[PDB]
Design a protein around this ligand. Structure first.
Ligand SMILES: */C(=C\C(=O)Nc1ccc2oc(-c3ccccn3)nc2c1)c1ccncc1
Ligand SMILES: */C(=C\C(=O)Nc1ccc2oc(-c3ccccn3)nc2c1)c1ccncc1
Lengths: 520, 524
């Protein structure tokens, strides 16, 4: 079975799979063509990412597809041997790989073999690390041996290993996105018998923070729930088919292990969902979309584009949603960071993660909360080339207390005010909020927008929530009394919600923001 | 085979240091008669250091090949990967072999792997090998012509006992190449690549900032990869492959140099024409930073030691840094641009030592206010400056925007005796700045800089740059919008764009601030 694993049996990493394919397969199938022009093939590739992804099979998939020899060195297995056994085994591994070429050597759990030098506390451990380094540098330029390694964090690996010529290409196999999750769910359910009511797309969309292993466990739990419901009360053996109810139940009881891991992807929020102003949209377009869309114009006119902006205004979800929408427009990855998250050298880490994604929209929320971290952010921004397509966006609700250093040119040089949404914006927001709900025909959104003025996006969302709570309360009470009288939200529900206006922004705050704008 | 042919030409990015090493090694190892006659003691330990990838690992081999001497290589990890007695036997066997075949050169690559700081060593085998190395080092009789060269990332990671007066007394830094060095490296690596006729490596080298030799090798590889990707994916092809300037630019776009955070030492390419500047300030800086270095004889004749430090205070902007870079450029002295934020994040002495190593240096300290009036850094800097021999051609320049806050200690004589002020640029300065800003971009013949300068008064360097930047964005905006309509209409930036940018003409420096600076000057 192992030799039969291919590209199709790995899900959740298709971009990285293409990268690895071009890096490895092509040289190992037409070495003459690459040598002619003079392209040097890579000699060390380090895959890293959260545990549970498919990065342990990537090496096997590549080796099988390229039809090359494959050798596996298991970190814990090597470190579980006597003093000389580990050295003999590393040497034998590399020698065997050289014997049969082209080859691939996968050193699973490298951080087990070569942890940070501080962690090591014996002569045997350091001797093994140095043995690995010596073997690594000994790969002749034409040996046709590619060393692949996997870890959780490259920082846990001995830095000497991450030098030129030893491990110079580092690829991240991160959390899958919705398409990746669907791919994994379709891979794992190959043998399970499904019912006709299963729509894996919804499951994939709803499974947040799930890695391939988590999805395998989820499928197993759903099958078990089906067994429980059926057998509890050969005929049955042939009448078993997991149902969407079982999958939803399994989702309910699941505890994904990758909840806290930052997510990088292209969000699915469009302009229509926030509405927003026109000037702000135009400015954001000019800043972010044009340089990526038409770099030629910037080059010919020869002025380097600015990197980041700094939204200010009353609190709410407009700023974050606006940034997400602009990122969606340009099809660039979106990275969200919260001040509380940062308070808990991570700054360099997140900046490098952004730099890895070519079009990225690095978002920093609650920037006001953020001396050491401030200086680290300052230096990192100052040391960001204004020619790489990485855009920093800030957000704050107290521009007065923001340190002026960040505002200095080259770091964050543009300020944009985000006012309360207007009538059209409020209409768009309300339409988005009730998008997934069965609203009644009588209800008109335009009148609601006219009635509500000065209400922040939070206020409108709260208004929608109050109405739905009323509908649920009515349905339950009617159901109890009856024991679909309330099939859709009615006007009375919305009016009852409106009974408590609760405007979250005072006119004094708006005047203060206006004064801040005028002073600029 | 190929190893024994590496020479001076096959190393790039280090030409000053290569000349130093040539004089310091090749000549003694070819004409010992003269050196012994006049009585010059050849060095016995040379420690090369710098960021990884710079090609210092070939310097030893290049020198050995050129001088025709025996060459022996000891690889740190290789020695430390053996059993307890194997590493000792190997060090001893290396030095014995080198001495047996004289003259020789011994290159101990990755010294810090063999002899780290005493504290970092926990076992006894590690300390035993370090002591073995020290014993062998001291055992080199002056008569025997053995020169030990070692390479390490930083000299501090090496055991201090090694950096003694008879072991490793010469330390050479091989740091990031400059633009000429980058061009040299690119020429070396593209020897076997077949390039197209539109490739002009000068622009690549100039734009490749923070790249080391290895990074440039990767860049060339990626460009070739892009070319093959496009053409092939879309024997004839094998003979039609030629990298193109588009491929090199694309490779640059997607490259992540590993030496971005490393301080750069180099003569800046900024001239007086790009800053304008008051004639008084220009003359004063000329005197201070040029007469001592250009006519030391006169200073000796009148016997007054030149002051070392100058301060700059005034409105925030690009003026101070540009002025310092210009004065450095005129004297062709190296420029070090330590910023305050970098220092906020031992280090002070390291910067001062780096400056000292480059004799004519224009060490720059921006935003000094943040560091000074904290206690630790300010005291360390005061101590280090006070220990700065005024007879050396190292000039310290400070910049600040709160001249009222800096502690008076820094301005006491012997530390920073001059207190020049940098005021807002005048009309001619603004004209020069605008000409420089638009120099790289096409401009309409109608557009006149003189009127724009006349309109702009009190505008800081950023203000002028902002004006130019805003105008270009308008031109790009208009240029593209026409393109979609047609789907060149805007070949150059027209005066309409400049006037539209001028519509929102803003002054970033309040006249109150300028008056405050004037008050400080008068009180001073
Ligand atoms: C939306 C985020 C959101 O609603 N954020 C938010 C709501 C209310 C807030 O009040 C404050 C505040 C702070 C200090 C003083 C007073 N009030 N901050 C608030 C923030 C959202 C984000 C991302 N995706 C979707 C929605
Ligand atoms: C130019 C650098 C430059 O213009 N930097 C700069 C612009 C504006 C600034 O405002 C402050 C400041 C300080 C304190 C309070 C308020 N504002 N600092 C500023 C710095 C330049 C540098 C290097 N090479 C070329 C040009």
């Amino acid at each position: 079975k192992l030799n039969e694993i291919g590209y199709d049996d790995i899900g959740g990493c298709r971009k990285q799979l293409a990268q690895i394919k071009e890096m490895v397969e092509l040289p190992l199938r037409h070495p003459q063509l690459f040598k002619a022009i003079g392209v040097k093939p890579p000699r060390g590739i380090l895959l890293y990412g959260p545990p549970g992804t498919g990065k342990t099979l990537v090496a096997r998939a590549v080796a099988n597809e390229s039809g090359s020899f494959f050798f596996l060195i298991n970190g814990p297995e090597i470190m579980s041997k006597l003093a000389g056994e580990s050295e003999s085994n590393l040497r034998k591994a590399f020698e065997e790989a050289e014997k049969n070429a082209p080859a691939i050597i996968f050193i699973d759990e490298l951080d087990a073999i070569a942890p940070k030098r501080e962690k090591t506390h014996g002569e045997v451990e350091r001797r093994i690390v140095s043995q690995l380094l010596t073997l690594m540098d000994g790969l002749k330029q034409r040996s046709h041996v590619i060393v692949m390694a996997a870890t959780n964090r490259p920082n846990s690996v001995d830095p000497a290993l991450r030098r030129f010529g030893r491990f110079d290409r580092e690829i991240e196999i991160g959390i899958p996105d919705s398409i990746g999750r669907l791919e994994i769910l379709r891979i794992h359910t190959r043998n399970i018998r499904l019912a006709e009511d299963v729509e894996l797309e919804k499951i994939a969309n709803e499974a947040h923070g799930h890695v391939g292993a988590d999805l395998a466990s989820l499928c197993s739990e759903a099958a078990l729930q089906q067994i429980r419901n059926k057998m509890n009360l050969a005929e049955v053996l042939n009448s078993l088919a997991v149902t969407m109810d079982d999958f939803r139940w399994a989702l309910g009881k699941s505890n994904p292990s990758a909840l806290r891991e930052t997510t990088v992807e292209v969000p699915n929020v469009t302009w229509d969902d926030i509405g927003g102003l026109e000037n702000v949209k135009r400015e954001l377009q000019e800043l972010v979309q044009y340089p990526v869309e038409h770099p030629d114009k910037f080059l010919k006119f020869g002025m380097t584009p600015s990197k980041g902006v700094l939204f200010y205004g009353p609190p709410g979800c407009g700023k974050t949603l606006l940034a997400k929408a602009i990122a969606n427009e340009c099809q660039a990855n979106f990275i969200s960071i919260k001040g509380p998250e940062l308070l808990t050298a991570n700054v360099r880490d997140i900046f490098d993660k952004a730099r890895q994604a070519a079009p990225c929209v690095l978002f920093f929320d609650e920037l006001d909360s953020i001396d050491r971290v401030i200086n680290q952010l300052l230096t990192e921004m100052d040391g960001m080339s204004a020619k790489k397509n990485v855009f920093i966006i800030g957000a704050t609700n107290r521009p007065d207390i923001i340190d002026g250093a960040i505002l200095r040119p080259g770091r964050l040089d543009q300020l944009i005010y985000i006012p309360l949404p207007d009538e059209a914006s409020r209409v768009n927001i309300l339409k988005a909020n009730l998008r997934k709900s069965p609203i009644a025909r009588d209800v008109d959104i335009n009148f609601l927008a006219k009635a509500t003025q000065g209400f922040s996006g939070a206020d409108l969302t709260e208004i929608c929530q109050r109405a739905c709570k009323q509908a649920i309360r009515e349905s339950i009470e009617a159901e109890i009394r009856a024991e679909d009288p309330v099939p859709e939200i009615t006007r009375r529900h919305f009016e009852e919600a409106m009974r408590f206006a609760r405007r979250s922004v005072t006119e004094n705050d708006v005047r203060k923001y206006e004064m801040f704008a005028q002073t600029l």
